[model samples]
Target: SVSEIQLLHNLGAHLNELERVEWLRKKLQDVHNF
Candidate 1:
């Protein structure tokens, strides 16, 4: 298994789960807007 330190090192602060889903949805919304 990967350690939290290594995860934070590679993925970093922006790396998330639920927030990414919202961000992804917003991105798609923008694409469909045009």
Candidate 2:
């Protein structure tokens, strides 16, 4: 679980902003069909 928690923490640390990240994430996910 350490690695998973660390991954989330690292993600949070570099996020531009909440909405921005979510928007980009959704856009990329849509692009890749994720």
Candidate 3:
């Protein structure tokens, strides 16, 4: 089944992980902010 909200949730989780990395955190956070 295709679910837009579910896909977004997964994407957000992935982004959240990327934002937690020591080096990538700042960059990812900055990019996701706006």
Candidate 4:
């Protein structure tokens, strides 16, 4: 949980809007593939 929280915290300020959307799409794709 802490690691996941930290992951979100680190990513929260890093990407632009489009990058975030792209990252989200990839994450969903990974889940879909699995």
If scored against the real structure, what TM-score would every candidate get? 0.31, 0.31, 0.21, 0.32
Estimate, for each residue in 1-34, the C-alpha lDDT of model 2 and write its tens digit. 3776676776667666566677877786678664
Ranking by lDDT: 4, 1, 2, 3
Ranked by TM-score, the better of candidates 3 and 4 is 4
Candidate order by decreasing TM-score? 4, 2, 1, 3
User: Candidate 1, 22: how far from true, in Å?
Assistant: 0.8
Candidate 3 lDDT by residue in tens digits, 1-34: 9877887766666665645475665776577665
| Model 4, position 5: C-alpha lDDT score | 71
Model 4 residue-pair collision total = 0
lDDT of 4 by residue, 1-34 (tens): 3775776766676658567687788886677664
Model 3: lDDT of residue 27: 73
RMSD, model 3, all Cα superposed? 8.2
Relative to the true structure, how large is the alpha-carbon lDDT of every model? 0.69, 0.69, 0.65, 0.70
Greater-TM-score candidate between 2 and 3: 2
Query: What are the RMSD figures for all models against the true structure?
Result: 6.3, 6.2, 8.2, 7.1
Model 3: colliding residue pairs: none
